[PDB]
Amino acid sequence: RKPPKGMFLSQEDVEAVSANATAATTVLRQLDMELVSVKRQIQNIKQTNSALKEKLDGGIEPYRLPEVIQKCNARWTTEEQLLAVQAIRKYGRDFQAISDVIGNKSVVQVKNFFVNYRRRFNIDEVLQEWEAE
Amino acid sequence: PSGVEGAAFQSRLPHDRMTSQEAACFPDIISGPQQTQKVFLFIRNRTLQLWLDNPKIQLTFEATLQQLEAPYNSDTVLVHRVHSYLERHGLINFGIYKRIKPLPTKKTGKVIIIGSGVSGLAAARQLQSFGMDVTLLEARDRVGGRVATFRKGNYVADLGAMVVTGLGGNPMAVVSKQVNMELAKIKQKCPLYEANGQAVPKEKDEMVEQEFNRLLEATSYLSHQLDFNVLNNKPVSLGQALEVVIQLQEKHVKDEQIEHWKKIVKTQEELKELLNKMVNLKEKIKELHQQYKEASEVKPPRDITAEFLVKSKHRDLTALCKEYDELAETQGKLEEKLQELEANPPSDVYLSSRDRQILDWHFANLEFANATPLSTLSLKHWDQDDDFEFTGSHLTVRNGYSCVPVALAEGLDIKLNTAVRQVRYTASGCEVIAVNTRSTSQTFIYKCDAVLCTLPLGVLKQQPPAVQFVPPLPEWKTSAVQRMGFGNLNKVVLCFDRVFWDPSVNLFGHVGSTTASRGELFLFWNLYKAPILLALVAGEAAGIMENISDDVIVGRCLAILKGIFGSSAVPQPKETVVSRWRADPWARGSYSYVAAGSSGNDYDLMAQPITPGPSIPGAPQPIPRLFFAGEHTIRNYPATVHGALLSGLREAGRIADQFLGAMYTL
Known about the structure:
Chain B: It is found in: Nucleus; Chromosome. The complex is a heterodimer of chains A (about 130) and B (about 675). Chain A is mainly α and about 130 residues long.
């Protein structure tokens, strides 16, 4: 009641291959041709990808900056406040980026910083200016 | 099986149920209490046993009663009925037995039997056994029919039936105790040797053979599960269905290849878009770097917006540098799936040209089994007789299978060289008109109560008729005759002085070059003790080799043999014989096959007797006068010797029932 293992026989298949005198030869040819269709499309995306790979010779090895190993302070120098504001007009709410700019401030004090200096540094206005960009 | 139950199996009867035949003769018992049924059944089985455990002497009723025990031997008439039924229908006291009770001096009734093949002989003996006058007419100068045996010196080789297909339930078993048949087992191992002259490696022999068998199951699936039995108003053949199954396996291989390479392109286009995203990132990075080192070349001390620029560009560069690293990890992965996918491609082909040629030999073998091209076999029904296969090893007959008909022919009135040429049957009797095969002018008239026709189906098929029926056979009989298949098979006998082959190899194959010539000399037999190799010609080759001279045919076998064994080991054969069964006019073929468009019901149609019209209009309906037997008439055992024999036994019991009466049905 089930075909033998390895054999592939469904209803749908069979009229397709019996429907005329050479419907078998035709059906095998379409698969045979569509098989070249795809082999060349492989050669051709091998070639495309082979060129793109050569443009990436050496990756980004010459463009890497050493690692800043910096212990995270708690006090805000007048300097670090000023980097902060500028980071906000350039980054908006991405606290991870902002901390990376200041360097020695973690994301939480960065959050605390927005609320703490909200009126003296017009943090609200700065975000509006960042929003229109 | 063992005991009385074993006897039922050896008689092809269920031990625990009564058959349709017995229900007809004992309608009292089958319709009655289940207890009496078991009584009967035991009585049957134990009588069968007695006959079977010694079949060289007649089993008289008294003798059966003595061995029978109570309470089974109480009802003396039940035992007389049972014994008489078995005797009539040839389940006991058939073959070549010595009589206790000598024949009644006066015979009753006259029967003419056309043909002294096995089916003819087996009826003739039964009818004589029953007290009738029997005469057989035989076109040939010999008995046996399609049991032919070559004899010259100590060379012995069957041109016809040669194998006893297993003794489990085979009536030839009984015959083998009655005749000196040297029954030699068959070593089933067969080395294939391809057209070069060298073995097919056991790697390849086994997986082609396994594909062959799988291709068969597949056609059966097509037949029974998907009802693929009619195409363009014509019934589907087996060969067609095999092509369809092969194509769909060739189609599947191509389909697998496409889905494989298609998931390569899918993943090498992910790679393409990954690389583009990595060019366009390496350029941002090459640029922000420039911007960063420019903003660093501004030496300190600098105002906070200058300081912010250096820090901002540094943060952005390390960000873009992290993205490009994540992409490199992703590129490495996908770059590895392409390596594995390329390394794991699916099968290139379904079957190679060398592989299909081996497959071709397994088809030639199957064409030999059925004596016909697989395009003629009915897909639905070609194997309808497998469920009655006998158990046990197949055997050959080392002293020649003709030993059997000749044995049966002993004591019978047989007119040889007598070609029946017209059969006349009427409400009052029959006349058979035959001529002498040597001088066809000399003419004979035989008159009888009944004719038993065992003309081979090929003869009945002949147009214009070789035998004329008067009146003509009814449409339902003639149409069965056209529908049925009558195949062809031929053998070449090669006689040698010296075994120059592997003597522990009974049979070995030769693989043909083409599909077309797949059956030409594709199998070789050494079964005989002496130096005799025997070569088969099956399928479409059979019909065509008959138009080729024996010297050319022997030539091709020598060439095939020379390649498998070397050009020096093959001596010229002394005696050569080549059968041409389709050309023989007393056969016109080898044996029947279930043609596409036929079925097993046609074999039953062939077995029906013919009843002529009333001589005087308004006279009462007459008795059947024309009866048929032979291998083409036994649905469950066609195209075999045991089948012909059983069909003879069948009609002799039926003719006797009609002309002598059945007194055991009360």
